[PDB]
Amino acid sequence: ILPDSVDWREKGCVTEVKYQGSCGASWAFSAVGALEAQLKLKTGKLVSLSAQNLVDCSTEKYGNKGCNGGFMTTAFQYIIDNKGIDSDASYPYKAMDQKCQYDSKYRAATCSKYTELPYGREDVLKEAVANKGPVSVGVDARHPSFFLYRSGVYYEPSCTQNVNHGVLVVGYGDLNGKEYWLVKNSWGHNFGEEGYIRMARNKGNHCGIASFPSYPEILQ
Numbered sequence: 114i115l116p117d118s119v120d121w122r123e124k125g126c127v128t129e130v131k132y133q134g135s136c137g138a139s140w141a142f143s144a145v146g147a148l149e150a151q152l153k154l155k156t157g158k159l160v161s162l163s164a165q166n167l168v169d170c171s172t173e174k175y176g177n178k179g180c181n182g183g184f185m186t187t188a189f190q191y192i193i194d195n196k197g198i199d200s201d202a203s204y205p206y207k208a209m210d211q212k213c214q215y216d217s218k219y220r221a222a223t224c225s226k227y228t229e230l231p232y233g234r235e236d237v238l239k240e241a242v243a244n245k246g247p248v249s250v251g252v253d254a255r256h257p258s259f260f261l262y263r264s265g266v267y268y269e270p271s272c273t274q275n276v277n278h279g280v281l282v283v284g285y286g287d288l289n290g291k292e293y294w295l296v297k298n299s300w301g302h303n304f305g306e307e308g309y310i311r312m313a314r315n316k317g318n319h320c321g322i323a324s325f326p327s328y329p330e331i332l333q
């Protein structure tokens with residue numbers, strides 16, 4: 114019933130790859146990237162949403178610590194509570210913790226709700242990515258092989274199911290027998306495959322890719 118491959122870049126639903134730098138804002142980029150695609154599906158415009166906005170404004174009330182980490186679920190909740198989020202163009206990413214400078218005048222997107230998927234269920238994640246859009250997930254990126262990844266289907270034997278780095282699953286496929294998830298990262302274009310990492314799929318929640326998935330929606 115589901116397609117064998119999906120790639121949301123092919124439907125103009127993914128913005129350019131971003132660069133987080135010294136700031137641990139991966140959670141924030143994961144969140145906006147998920148919302149960006151929902152905005153494209155609804156409005157037909159692809160605009161990069163402000164990760165910085167999340168870092169500066171979705172703080173203690175959402176259990177997040179800006180550059181010292183956070184959560185995509187709580188970020189989606191901030192966007193709901195805030196009744197908006199600014200464009201990246203208006204609230205650019207400065208890779209450090211700042212005061213909250215959200216202005217409703219430059220609101221580029223809204224958020225109605227978000228869904229959390231069951232832990233470790235790669236079948237359920239496969240469906241969400243096909244039926245709903247790119248899904249915010251965490252991975253275990255705490256290995257040298259992650260940093261050193263250049264291409265191919267990434268597989269790390271030491272990889273736990275405990276997540277620590279925010280990424281975005283923009284599709285899935287099969288590279289000569291090896292099933293993978295197509296993962297947008299936030300380390301610039303010089304990381305992996307033009308900023309993307311294809312990661313092992315259906316290998317026992319490898320690197321905890323399906324440990325904490327979630328995606329937002331912008332309802333009519």
Ligand SMILES: CS(=O)(=O)N1CCc2c(c(-c3ccc(Cl)c(C#Cc4ccc(Cl)c(CNCc5ccccc5)c4)c3)nn2CCCN2CCOCC2)C1
Nearest residue numbers: 137140176177178181182183250251275276277278279325
């Ligand atoms: C060790 S574990 O089992 O893998 N784990 C613990 C449980 C967990 C985790 C996550 C989760 C899911 C996706 C991602 Cl991308 C992340 C992450 C991360 C991250 C990103 C950058 C950084 Cl720099 C860090 C490192 N700092 C830790 C930190 C994390 C959050 C707040 C304050 C400090 C971590 C965590 N959600 N959750 C679910 C808990 C969410 N609760 C619900 C109530 O509101 C938020 C807290 C992690």
